[PDB]
Design a protein around this ligand. Structure first.
Ligand code: HEC
Length: 112
């Protein structure tokens, strides 16, 4: 694509002022939130708790696995990551994700 997963995470770490923490990324992805839309309390609502398996939209359509081990071109387009993180962080958490959250989330997801 136009980027690597490491280039994306390094850009978020620089904006956050701190290195990514994959354990924090895992905890946020699996968390149940209450600030967003009622139908999407968690990232897992659509991507599941195991991102090597397919996910599902709110209507039951299949979403390709988020793990790069299952779907190889993941996180290789910078605009596509921002586009989905913009929409999905707002739906789940109710606000954009911070650069530190994005760094943490991608560092966990990029290793799956
Ligand atoms: C359903 C309403 C979703 C919720 C809740 C979350 N995501 Fe999602 N995500 C969804 C779709 C339909 C898509 C696009 C289709 C695809 O196969 O990519 C995505 C995509 C992403 C991506 C982009 C991956 C890439 O190709 O670079 C990321 C990084 C992502 N989703 C992360 C993510 C997080 C962190 C979420 C909780 C805040 C989350 N998603 C929720 C559908 C839905």
């Amino acid at each position: 694509g136009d980027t690597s997963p490491a280039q994306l995470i390094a850009g978020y770490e620089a904006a956050a002022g701190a290195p990514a923490d994959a354990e924090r990324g895992r905890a946020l992805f699996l968390s149940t939130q209450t600030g967003g839309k009622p139908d999407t309390p968690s990232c897992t609502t659509c991507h599941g708790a195991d991102v090597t398996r397919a996910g599902q939209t709110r209507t039951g359509k299949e979403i390709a696995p988020l793990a790069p081990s299952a779907t190889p071109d993941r996180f290789t387009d910078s605009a596509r990551v921002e586009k989905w993180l913009g929409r999905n962080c707002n739906s789940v958490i109710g606000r954009d994700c911070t650069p530190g959250e994005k760094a943490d989330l991608l560092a966990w997801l990029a290793a799956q």
